[PDB]
Amino acid sequence: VRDGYIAQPENCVYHCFPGSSGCDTLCKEKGGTSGHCGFKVGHGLACWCNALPDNVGIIVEGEKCHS
């Protein structure tokens, strides 16, 4: 696992609803045991996930955003 800004698979950001509310639940259904909002200057607004496995993934740049 890692602790990171969660995107969407792959090379994206998600967008968070300040509060955490929705994105926290999104983090938990993907499989991070805490999540929050955050901002990652680069792309923009993003969400955060603690204890996501590395077979779930995050902000990357190299490509552009996917799904």
Swiss-Prot record:
A GO molecular-function descriptor: sodium channel inhibitor activity
InterPro entries the record matches: LCN-type_CS_alpha_beta_dom, Scorpion_toxin-like, Scorpion_toxin-like_sf, Scorpion_toxinL, Scorpion_toxinL/defensin
Keyword Transmembrane helix: no
Predominant subcellular localization, coarse grouping: secreted
SMART domains assigned to the protein according to its UniProt record, in alphabetical order: Knot1
Superkingdom of origin organism: Eukaryota
CDD domains the record matches: neurotoxins_LC_scorpion
LCN-type CS-alpha/beta domain mapped to chain residues: 2-66
UniProt xrefs under Pfam families: Toxin_3
GO biological process: defense response
Alphabetically ordered keywords of this record: Amidation, Disulfide bond, Ion channel impairing toxin, Neurotoxin, Secreted, Toxin, Voltage-gated sodium channel impairing toxin
Tissue specificity annotation: Expressed by the venom gland.
Residue list for modification Serine amide: S67
CC annotations in GO: extracellular region
Record's subcellular location: Secreted
Keyword Nucleotide-binding tagged: no
Cysteine disulfide partners in this protein: C12-C65, C16-C37, C23-C47, C27-C49
Family per record: Belongs to the long (4 C-C) scorpion toxin superfamily. Sodium channel inhibitor family. Alpha subfamily.
Subunit structure: Monomer.
Entry note about domains: Has the structural arrangement of an alpha-helix connected to antiparallel beta-sheets by disulfide bonds (CS-alpha/beta).
Function: Alpha toxins bind voltage-independently at site-3 of sodium channels (Nav) and inhibit the inactivation of the activated channels, thereby blocking neuronal transmission. The dissociation is voltage-dependent. This alpha-like toxin is highly toxic to insects and competes with LqhaIT on binding to insect sodium channels. Differs from classical anti-mammalian alpha-toxins as it inhibits sodium channel inactivation in cell bodies of hippocampus brain neurons, on which the anti-mammalian Lqh2 is inactive, and is unable to affect Nav1.2 in the rat brain, on which Lqh2 is highly active.
Name under which the protein is recorded: Alpha-like toxin Lqh3
Organism, scientific name: Leiurus hebraeus
Lineage of origin: Eukaryota, Metazoa, Ecdysozoa, Arthropoda, Chelicerata
